[model samples]
Target: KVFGRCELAAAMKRHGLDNYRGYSLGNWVCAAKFESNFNTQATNRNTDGSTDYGILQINSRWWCNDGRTPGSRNLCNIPCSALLSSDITASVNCAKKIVSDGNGMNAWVAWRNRCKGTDVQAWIRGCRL
Candidate 1:
């Protein structure tokens, strides 16, 4: 419920994420669509007790503290709840960090299975920017 795909693209552009870390804005939009449907409050629990959070569906295994987990790398140094807000700055920052670690969008299974090697412009259809 964060609003327009075009608006998301604008935000991404404004935040210096249009071609962030070498990944296209289309990839971000495509991955976000599959991961959270652009919902900031999205969360999904893994079979291993890990959880994904926010638009990028960042995982507790490496990015944030979920309080119940014991050995998370907590690489983003923020609580998972922080990612569940409408303001996506924290989530975006964490996603950038994740991709910067050489994982790229490949860190997201949705991106790998659904977005990789595909033409992604459809995710941003009608987005004038």
Candidate 2:
């Protein structure tokens, strides 16, 4: 993976994501923690036959195609496998687009159900960012 939770925050800061699209870096890190435990190659198959992608757990239904899956809307115009990289450029860029579309981090169920009301500063602790 590209980062540990601490390194993740520093990387986000370096990526200009300390605060982007109205969400804090802690929010992103918290979401990533819950989503895939920061594994970039992580994938979870949903009961509905769709899948979640990468650190953010982006959905194949709306964000990207898994290639084998048919009829993906692929709003990010990228292969879902692209999110499974140590390089986070595509995943972070797509996340920004998702937030810009007004979904914010609400696009992620892990964020909504887990990280939303919790204190997430621990995700960035020791990052010094």
Candidate 3:
């Protein structure tokens, strides 16, 4: 399912992403825009033969294991396909691990490209904090 702006905002907030790990929900929300268009079933193949899957496009090489990626670590202890579900529970939980991995929210290129130091309040406007 593709989530609307506020729909994704509310879900991110409900999942503790508002200020999680010192990062704002808009960062993830904005990343979702470029990463997957908020589509749960999104997938992209990387040049190194790995894949990024789901709403936030979690990678196959270091995060979730797809069993087909050559060097998937499955550090999130989940199948890559699990992130494709609309529920987002697994993907969100795994996202926490991503932010905690020393790099924090910069794991997503979209955040650095479009969200950081920008007027991100627009992503949270309709959704009550």
List, residue by residue over 21-129, the lDDT tens digit for candidate 3: 9877877788888889999999999899999999999999999988888756989999999999989888899998999999877898877777778877767777765
Question: Candidate 2 lDDT, tens digit per residue, 1-129?
Answer: 846888888777777777897778889999888898988989999887889988888889888988766676889999999989897888888888888887677888889999997887767877776
Worst window of 10 by summed lDDT in candidate 3 = 120-129
Q: How accurate is candidate 1 locally (lDDT)?
A: 0.87
lDDT of 1 by residue, 14-123 (tens): 77777798878889988888898888999999988899999899999999999967777799999999999888898899998998988678999999999998998777
Look at candidate 3 and give me any clashing residue pairs: none
Per-model CA lDDT versus the true structure: 0.87, 0.84, 0.87
